[PDB]
Design a protein around this motif. Sequence first.
Motif, PDB file in Angstrom:
ATOM      1  N   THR A 292      46.215  38.349  35.250  1.00  0.00           N
ATOM      2  CA  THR A 292      45.122  39.051  34.584  1.00  0.00           C
ATOM      3  C   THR A 292      44.741  40.316  35.341  1.00  0.00           C
ATOM      4  OG1 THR A 292      44.120  37.250  33.320  1.00  0.00           O
ATOM      5  CG2 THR A 292      42.642  38.926  34.214  1.00  0.00           C
ATOM      6  N   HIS A 293      44.629  40.225  36.666  1.00  0.00           N
ATOM      7  CA  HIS A 293      44.351  41.414  37.464  1.00  0.00           C
ATOM      8  C   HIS A 293      45.526  42.383  37.435  1.00  0.00           C
ATOM      9  CE1 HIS A 293      41.886  38.084  39.117  1.00  0.00           C
ATOM     10  NE2 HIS A 293      40.948  39.012  39.163  1.00  0.00           N
TER      11      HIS A 293
ATOM     12  N   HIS B 148      39.602  46.473  40.109  1.00  0.00           N
ATOM     13  CA  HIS B 148      40.426  45.319  39.878  1.00  0.00           C
ATOM     14  C   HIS B 148      41.467  45.181  40.959  1.00  0.00           C
ATOM     15  CE1 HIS B 148      38.660  45.478  35.809  1.00  0.00           C
ATOM     16  NE2 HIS B 148      38.951  44.190  35.774  1.00  0.00           N
TER      17      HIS B 148
ATOM     18  N   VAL C  40      45.166  46.117  36.062  1.00  0.00           N
ATOM     19  CA  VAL C  40      45.492  47.259  36.911  1.00  0.00           C
ATOM     20  C   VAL C  40      46.434  48.205  36.181  1.00  0.00           C
ATOM     21  CG1 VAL C  40      46.889  47.894  38.900  1.00  0.00           C
ATOM     22  CG2 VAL C  40      44.996  46.297  39.177  1.00  0.00           C
TER      23      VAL C  40
ATOM     24  N   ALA D 251      40.763  42.733  43.613  1.00  0.00           N
ATOM     25  CA  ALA D 251      40.936  41.348  43.337  1.00  0.00           C
ATOM     26  C   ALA D 251      42.363  41.004  43.615  1.00  0.00           C
ATOM     27  CB  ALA D 251      40.612  41.071  41.906  1.00  0.00           C
ATOM     28  N   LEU D 252      43.302  41.773  43.082  1.00  0.00           N
ATOM     29  CA  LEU D 252      44.693  41.403  43.257  1.00  0.00           C
ATOM     30  C   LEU D 252      44.900  41.233  44.728  1.00  0.00           C
ATOM     31  CD1 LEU D 252      48.072  42.795  42.429  1.00  0.00           C
ATOM     32  CD2 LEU D 252      47.122  40.491  42.398  1.00  0.00           C
TER      33      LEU D 252
END
Lengths: 413, 62, 105, 49, 321, 9
Positions: free
Chosen positions: E261-262, E281, E266, E284-285
Amino acid sequence: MNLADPDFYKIGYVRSFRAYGVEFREGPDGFGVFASKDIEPLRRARMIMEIPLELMLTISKRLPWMFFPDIVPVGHPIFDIINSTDPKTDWDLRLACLLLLAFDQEDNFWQLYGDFLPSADECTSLLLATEEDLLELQDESLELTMREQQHRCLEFWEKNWHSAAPLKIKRLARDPKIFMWAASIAQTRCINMEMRIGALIQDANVLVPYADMLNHSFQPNCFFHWRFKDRMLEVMINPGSRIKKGEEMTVNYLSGQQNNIFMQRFGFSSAVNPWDAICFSGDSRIHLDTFLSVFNITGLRQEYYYNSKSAKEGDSFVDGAVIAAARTLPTWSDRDVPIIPSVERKAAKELQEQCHEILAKYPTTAKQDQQILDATEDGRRTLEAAIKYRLHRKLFIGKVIDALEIYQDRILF
Amino acid sequence: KSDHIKARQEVLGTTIIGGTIPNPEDAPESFRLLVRELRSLALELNHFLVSERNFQINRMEA
Amino acid sequence: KDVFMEAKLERVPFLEEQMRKVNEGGGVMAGDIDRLMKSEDNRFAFVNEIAAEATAYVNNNRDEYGHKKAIHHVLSNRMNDAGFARPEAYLETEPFSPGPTYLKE
Amino acid sequence: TSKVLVSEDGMSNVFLPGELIGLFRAERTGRALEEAICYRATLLGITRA
Amino acid sequence: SAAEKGLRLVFMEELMSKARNRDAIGVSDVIYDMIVAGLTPGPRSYHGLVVAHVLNADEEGAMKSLRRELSVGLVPLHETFVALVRLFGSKGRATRGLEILAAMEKLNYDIRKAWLVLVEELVRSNHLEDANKVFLKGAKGGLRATDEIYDLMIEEDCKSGDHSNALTIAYEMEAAGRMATTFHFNCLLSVQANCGIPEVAFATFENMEFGEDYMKPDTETYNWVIQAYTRAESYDRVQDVAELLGLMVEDHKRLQPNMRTHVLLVECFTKYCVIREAIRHFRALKNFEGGTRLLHSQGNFGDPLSLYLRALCREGRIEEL
Amino acid sequence: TGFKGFVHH
């Protein structure tokens, strides 16, 4: 097999109940629903026993409790009894309260329908039995459960009928043996269904007059349907099923669950019990694709069939016991495409002989034997019923042994 | 009962003799005329039938 | 015990004339359609199923329909499997007609 | 009343100002994005809607 | 009497032993032992020779092993037909399996178990086209199938890109009571995402978002619809990604984001210049053990890792570079 | 009636 009294069909017929090709009988048993004339095979279903919603109790199955044929008045001090009842455990208590309420409110339909219901001297449920009658049962887990279940209702009798008892709440159960009758009736004649009243799909435990008279048989030919628009419960004849001129029409009580320890709890006792067997162990394993092959029993455990178009009437030895003990036993299968090893030293004979040793002609306790069957003494409607349960368990074990030795004899044609 | 050139004749045929009347496929001639005079103004109007099982474009001819 | 057993059950007489005007006015079909639709959830699905069954009826035995109105045929077939005699295709006859055509009011 | 109008000084890159995206269209992305969304309101008439 | 059957089991125990070692004429001589002394070989004995050849992968040897069954007149066993169809499906015989299927259609035997094992075996080898044809033909009529088969073919067909076959099975599955859950929708969305047209996967998603309890969207479902929108060939598609994130954000106590999802967010937020939205984002990854290797993936799809590095430089964001 | 359409197995 005599028909019921004319008042039986009426009183409910006047309240929009229509039965087309059936006629309830009166002979001493559960009243029973037997048909007349012949129907011949059909396409989808034939509707029967038009039962409206007004002649029900239908307490809801989850919080909050609602009764669509409203029986409890607003502010009546019996909804507090129900709302204080433990959910998800004892659904037969609040149902018993509703049944007791529908006996002294007004000229309610259940005030008149109570007479046709079995009385305390009648009925087979174990909640009305006694101590030594419960002891007369070759089972201790069932004995413990039923001794506890005879309690938990004495307890829920003194918590709401204890010397204060407003006359509305009183005069409904003046003693803890008619409350047991109501509890037994609720246990025996409750059915859990889905009821779409308006925009509300709900699950509810309901009581259905003129439909509980449908006796039980594990080979059923009747569906229960709920017509969404006009709020009517209907029995349905199965598609493609011929019907005789007075034979039994049955609807199953429990399917996919049995073991004869819960069905017996819910009334009478098992006869063929196509879903019960005794754990064997004691040996290594027996073959799988030969027990169902000698009798031409179809596989797919959830749906087992006999294929009556088998042979030149090869045998008359198929029953619920055969179809049950054909799937609750070691039944080694391995790769499912073996050589089918006819190694009677391992794949046959001694191993099932070990089962014959495991089932060493009732070796557990053997409290009684062949002498018990047909003692020729009927009484109290609950005695001779525990004896009947013992008879039927012994018969199931004996017929399982017989089927096993027939199978082990016929592996070569 | 309107514009279809090829469908009035076939309903007449399947109604003189008898059969199950089949639902039509092509649009009536009204839509064809519409695309015709929207072509005269240097504009397109293309129908498509993107399939739900193959995602293959099935552009109708008009 | 309840004294209304027969007061609410006395048969209403003189009903024979209020049995016929239902039958030529289409009342029986109208009162059968709703009873067939009494259990259906979506009426459009029921109508489409009836239409498809009638189309199959026309296809399999073509050289009979044109009078029988196969939609009436399938409706009668569905109503005839739970009692409800409902003569075939709801066909109407002229029992007393030494003539070709009724005036029809 | 179901559509908002992206007010001025709400450029960002997703919603150009002057756009007339839906109410849910704006309130779902405002809970996720962080630019100047900056819509206000439209009570569009029966013709304009 | 007892001696006759007592002698019968003597050869019977060793008769199947001639199938233990996979003998061709050794089992025949055992049958020849009783054909000489007059012992009609019970169809189970008759079937044991069929097992002997089928364990040798003998295509026509097993057919000859059964060709004599109808000549004699003995009705073959249920196991007899079951054994052969397993071999024919394993080797890839398309029409041969149906040839046996006609036999039980005349011998008052149900084909459900045989057609189930035949269908399953054909998938156990790479005969994917054969598997769909056999299942569809049998299930077009009245033939209930076990739920395990339904899960297998829907996933398998979508694995090789057979949406046309998978969708028909899913439609056929719902006809026979079983209701499609989020697992089946997730399999379908795998190939509908890689179809170019975005609004073919969204229609599937809307069938789940406003669906029942079991068919509610999963965290994998949002990944597929997000992926299907970020690689469209034309038209603006950034606003529709904003909706999907918003719906995912609102339904959060049941759905939690994952690595993909990330990664997709991105990529999507960097192709169009919503760089800020990306840097966020990216972070997060950052805390995922897959790193940017999955975000880079291969050099295809425009090399999204190249986008993030390049686009950070050309805009001004250098410390995060 | 043009909402879904019939299938009949």
